[PDB]
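To close the chapter, one final illustration. This time we ask the reader to focus less on the individual chains and more on the assembly as a whole: which components sit near each other, and how the overall shape emerges from the parts.
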Amino acid sequence: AKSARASRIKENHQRFKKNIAGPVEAARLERLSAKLMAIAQASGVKSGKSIGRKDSSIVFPM
Amino acid sequence: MRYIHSEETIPVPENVKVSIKSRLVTVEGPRGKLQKDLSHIAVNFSVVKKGVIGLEIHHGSRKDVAALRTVRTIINNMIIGVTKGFKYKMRYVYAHFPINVNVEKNAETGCYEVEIRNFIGEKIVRKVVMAPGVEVEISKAQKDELILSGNSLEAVSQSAADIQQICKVRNKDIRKFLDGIYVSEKGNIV
Amino acid sequence: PSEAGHRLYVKGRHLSYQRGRRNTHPKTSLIKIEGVDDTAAANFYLGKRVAYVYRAQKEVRGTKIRVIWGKITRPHGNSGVVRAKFTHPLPARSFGASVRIMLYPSSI
Amino acid sequence: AGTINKPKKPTSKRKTTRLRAKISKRAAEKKRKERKLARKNPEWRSKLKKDPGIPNLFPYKERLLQQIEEERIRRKEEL
Amino acid sequence: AEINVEATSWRRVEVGRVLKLENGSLAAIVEIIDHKRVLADGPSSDPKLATPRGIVPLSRALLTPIVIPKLPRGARTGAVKKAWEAYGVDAKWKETNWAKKQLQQERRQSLTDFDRFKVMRLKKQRRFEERKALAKIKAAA
Amino acid sequence: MGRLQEYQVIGRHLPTEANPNPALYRMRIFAPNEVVAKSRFWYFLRGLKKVKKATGEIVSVNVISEKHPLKVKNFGIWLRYDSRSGTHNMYKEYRETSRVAAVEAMYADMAARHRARFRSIHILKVVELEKTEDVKRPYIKQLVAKNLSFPLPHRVPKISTKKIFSAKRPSTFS
Amino acid sequence: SHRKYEAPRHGSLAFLPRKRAARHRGRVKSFPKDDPKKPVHLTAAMGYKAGMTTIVRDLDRPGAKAHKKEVVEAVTIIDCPPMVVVGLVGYIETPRGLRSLTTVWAEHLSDEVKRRFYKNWYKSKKKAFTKYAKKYAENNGASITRELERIKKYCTVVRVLAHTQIRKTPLKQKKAHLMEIQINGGSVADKVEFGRSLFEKPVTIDTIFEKDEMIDVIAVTKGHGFVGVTARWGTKKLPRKTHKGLRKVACIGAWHPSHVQWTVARAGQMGYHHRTSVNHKIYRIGKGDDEAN
Amino acid sequence: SSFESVVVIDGKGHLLGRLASIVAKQLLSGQKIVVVRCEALNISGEFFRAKLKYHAYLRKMTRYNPTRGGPFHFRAPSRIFYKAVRGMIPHKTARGAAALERLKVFEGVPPPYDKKKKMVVPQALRVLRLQPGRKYCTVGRLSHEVGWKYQDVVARLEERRKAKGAAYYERKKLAARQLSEAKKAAAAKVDPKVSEALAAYGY
Amino acid sequence: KNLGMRKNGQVWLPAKKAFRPTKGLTSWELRVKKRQEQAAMK
RNA sequence: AACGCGACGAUACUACCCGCACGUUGUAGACGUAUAAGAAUAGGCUCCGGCCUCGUAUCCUAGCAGGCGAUUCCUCCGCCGGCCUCGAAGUGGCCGUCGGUAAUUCGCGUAUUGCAAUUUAGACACGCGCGGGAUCAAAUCCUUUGCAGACGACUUAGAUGUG
RNA sequence: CAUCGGUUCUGGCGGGGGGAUAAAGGCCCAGGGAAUGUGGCUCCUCCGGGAGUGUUAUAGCCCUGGGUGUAAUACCCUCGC
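The assembled structure is written out below.
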């Protein structure tokens, strides 16, 4: 019997993933993303535009 | 023995434009442009005469002298590729089940794609993607013939070899089952 | 104000004792002097006085800093490493520590 | 052979003292045995040694042959 | 047939090539023994650049850009000296940047402590004008 | 095999009542010193004649210096060396400036290429090639060519072994 | 000498050590890989295992023996009250791995998620996130804007913090469960905007998972306590009245090294292991509002 | 010879064992060494020999319990170099341990070493040591083939660092050009006696 | 054009020359003179 | 990793932060503990003129361990604030204020440590201090739970509640 | 620190002797010779350079003898500072 880690079995699984299960997963993911988007939609220093510093070691201390 | 000096010469036609910098050969011709990295071989390039490229090795052994012939043949094949091109004609023969070959050009990858079907009645659909620059057509003059054309001899011959190796009979007598795709003719486009 | 330094000595490193492969002799120490790379350069610093300066815990006679005194005797090898002898053998923990080779006694 | 991806047990170059002593003693005993068989050996041995001669690529081989022939004639005349 | 080859161009050892030895003196190759040794002669009037005739290993020599033109192979010391004074090898060596670097090195190592102090003072005096010029350049453009 | 000097060693048998004037034998021997030269003389003389050290004497030992040490010369050496199989001839050529330097190059080359020691090599002839047509080995024929000029690619610069760290990656073009 | 009759190993070496899990909630070791041309979506959720029941399924599996027939199958029911997103964690790539860079929390956090930060909630002053809630007010949330822009600029992996609504379950636990759920699809700015729009909002299970999809279930198994080798590893029982025990392994060793190897079955903890089981089909996502789900 | 506070070494183009020997001698002499870009180190001989040696290393493991006492095989190039250095130091003594605390190894050039001078050791450089025509490999390729997971992350961080260094290089070129024009301008205002004295002194 | 056939079929291959790295070290007439001298000596 | 690391929340107490106020406090060991292109090595750099063995280089380097007063200069350094910027283990640029500052020259002081004796001088961390600013927290035992369990450990619950 | 004594490590300088009274080598004198043939001449030419001829010419080299010369230097031995 061909192994699970066999090159031809892997190629067959890759073709299955590309051609058959791929569109189904894409359509399901698009529907779920739309449903979650429904719930989701339903100076620089003083304004946060300039990302400043927050308010052993890599080098030898010297 | 360490030979003090050894040299080879490559004549260049008038249509061919050769640019060499840091052992990176770029050959320009009427048909296209080829590029090759020969940085793994210690060669000094020069222009010994107008239209002649000079290859030299200094203080090299016999192996280092002999590698200049491989460099010479590679650059000569690049010149022949950009001037006249390379063409491999292949024949696919069958005994009972006719072999179906469809040639397309995948545009996003920009490369030719050969699809082989009905080989010994097998239901699998074989697919070979070609090297860039290799153009595959089905010959209208002859029967059951593919034509692979290009500027790169290595790319054309490797694509032809891939086509020949993908259709290989297994677990059968090769004396009795003679089917497959074979490289029939090797030559130049022009 | 002056923007210079105050160094009148050459830096050195205490490498090891005089030793074979196995047996070590703490009575003689090996010192690598900065910039000295051969016996001809070590010949200048033969006879110079070398000090090992370290810091202790208890303050004795106004300071917490102790000095072991010694001097350079002969060159060692071919790469400018010198042999030195001190009043007491240098600590084994000080292998790799810094020592000061002073310019006295002077022949210039 | 799939040696690179899956190596086998290494062959040790670290010899043992037992092996070194045994090899030395077997070597000495073999030397004595070949000396004994050389003394008892009945194969014929030539007293004279077949001399290799003079190389052909020596450029003055002709002049050396001239010198040898001349010295031979001189010795024959003296005798 | 446009051929554009940009490759390395080494200096070559040849009869007439002037070598610079480790001690700072000069020689000329008069006969090549092998790929590792040459026969050389330094017949220069200056004692510092002079080199006795003999074998020079090519590891301990540096290829100068001076080549004595049309020098016979195996020419003796008189002929090499005649070619040396005819071509003016000494003047070209003085013009060579290697001898300028060597002369700068001797001038730096021949300094006393008073010389070093005066060098520091005059270098600061020059640095003042260079700093003013740089400030003016940065202000203008 | 070391800094070698060529010596003429002249020796003879001790004079007896039968032979008041015994024949003198002169040999040219490459040796590091006169003691080794006399030892090699007695060895080669024991290999040829009925004379040994106890029954003979050394008449003279003189140093043979090179006539022209400043002239590049081609030397052909015919030698015999002893290996596992037996004694074999070798003819080799060396482009040197003296016979002694040619002999040192010979000893180094035979040690490097055939594992032959000083004790197993007999130097039979060392000759000067007067004309370049007498040169037969191609590794000397490529050196005696006309207008011989060659570059030296990939010259590793000589940096002091005591300077450990450098701030610039060195170049190999000078 | 060699073993006379060949037999495979009892147990798997891939699930060692057989120790208790480091914490009660299952850990998502790996998330699905991110494709930036995909739409933004959540990849994980939490629930509480209620029990099991029986179904009858009208099977449509061509080529099978029970094709166009009825099959009785066992199913597991998981109660899934809606989850509340209360945070956003940013991750950067380092040569030492993924590194958490910043974490932005919602302005209002429930007492359910606040109980997770305390071991004695009843004695506490409940001061959690009180000073953090004031940075939404001071300087118009300038610090919050800075951290969000830091996630947008420097991070490659964005995860929301989501907690369960445990009061909707019949459990006596009042302390909620909180986890990081990776946002897959879109760009990093899209993920940050997606989380910012999802702060303080309930997220239902039907917007994360959909019927007839295979998912993976990550949990901690049933604990059994200290268990001997016979039930821990499935070893053969020794014959009756074997000296010093028959529910043991007769030889823990007969060969060099002079040690017990890590591959020998020994008595110890069984169960309470962290397990990730794959390829479980969703048969029905039933709604709580439906009275006939 | 010069004693320095810390010596930062560029691992690119260097031979593993020779650099390890020199670094270990400096560490035992008392010098702090920080080696960067350990993925760009070189091993002489073509890649299959290094792969064979590392697989032979991976073969060795303790039998009764692989979580203790056994050879722990590290797939990072930095810790491969650290193993090479640690084999050259008496690490089971206090002196050897203290010598090893003076060493830091990294993949790529993390900050703030990106804005520090990186020196090279000519006694271990592959271009100055190996004969042309001999084959070699890189430690990073071997690490990636035996299990190192961060070849791409270190790579992308290296193009970011090189782009920032390129911007710094254009700034340094501009500064050097303005310095040259400043010297040419100040040559006409400095005292000729001062200029002649400096030229005679060698400056 | 190329008037003959190649056995392997690589018709683009150039008319290769003999691998003689020791070329040009001896003229033809000198070799003939050395042949006569070697024959006489032998 | 129970002697690997990150983010976050709350932090009573002398506990936290700021300034100077010093250590018979600790440091495999300060003494100018100065210096960022990348890449190639059978080729590179550039200001585009040329240059490349060479870090034997460049910067900095004078004054009671470095004073006082001028003559003189607009050069260099440092602390703050603003705007940008720096995520690989996060920090530099510009502008503005303030303070110091031989690039030139001069005067007043240096002694007596007695003919050398480490040149007690740097950095980080820690503690004791004051003088000010900021904040009023948890864990465990106990009772309970049984998703757990030999015992510890673990999942819970115990402050007004949907207990 | 100075002046000493014993032992020892290391650096520099001034002399002497020997060999083929070093061998070379430079500068002269008198001969002879050759090519990896200089100038010249001739023939090809991509005219960039090759090919042939012959003994110094508009380069030089090698061999032999003599003078400077009891030259210098290397090496070995040695007397001292």
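Residues 6-10, 20, 62, 97-98, 101, 104-105, 108-109, 117, 120-121, 123-129, 131-132, 135 of chain E lie near RNA strand J (CB under 10 Å from a C1'). Chain E touches chain B at residues 1-8, 35 (CB under 8 Å). With these observations in hand, you are ready for the problems at the end of the chapter.
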